[PDB]
Design a protein around this ligand. Structure first.
Ligand SMILES: *[C@@H]1O[C@H](CO)[C@@H](O)[C@H](O)[C@H]1NC(C)=O
Ligand SMILES: *[C@@H]1O[C@H](CO)[C@@H](O)[C@H](O)[C@H]1NC(C)=O
Ligand SMILES: *[C@@H]1O[C@H](CO)[C@@H](O)[C@H](O)[C@H]1NC(C)=O
Lengths: 53, 42
């Protein structure tokens, strides 16, 4: 959480961070892209077959 | 400073929150996954 990590529990700081805009969103877009592919990495390795033998 | 005691300051605003939803074109109903918590705050 890039609003929480930068400005802890602070309204005055969080209002200043919102002037920086998409920075907080683009970091999580890359971390989510990792979180999605890490479940995809596990999906590609351990499940190659539809049937559980 | 008045009576002598040691108070830990624990930050508020704790635990992850996720949004489980179908596309807004489908429905506006959402499920909210609260990580790191039991069912209490809501
Ligand atoms: C200050 O307040 C504390 C309680 O918070 C009390 O124990 C202490 O005696 C007070 N000191 C004076 C002299 O006001
Ligand atoms: C919303 O769903 C309808 C019905 O399936 C579809 O015709 C339309 O293209 C969708 N619009 C958007 C913005 O996804
Ligand atoms: C929540 O607490 C109950 C006991 O009150 C426990 O059985 C349950 O597993 C807990 N759930 C979580 C959040 O792990």
């Amino acid at each position: 959480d890039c609003t929480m990590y930068i400005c802890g529990d602070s309204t005055e700081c969080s209002n200043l961070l919102l002037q920086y805009g998409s920075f907080c969103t683009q970091l999580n877009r890359a971390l989510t892209g990792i979180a999605v592919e890490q479940d995809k990495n596990t999906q590609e390795v351990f499940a190659q077959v539809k049937q559980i033998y | 400073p008045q009576t002598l005691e040691i108070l830990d300051i624990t930050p508020c605003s704790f635990g992850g929150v996720s949004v489980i939803t179908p596309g807004t074109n489908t429905s506006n109903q959402v499920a909210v996954l609260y990580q790191d918590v039991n069912c209490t705050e809501v």
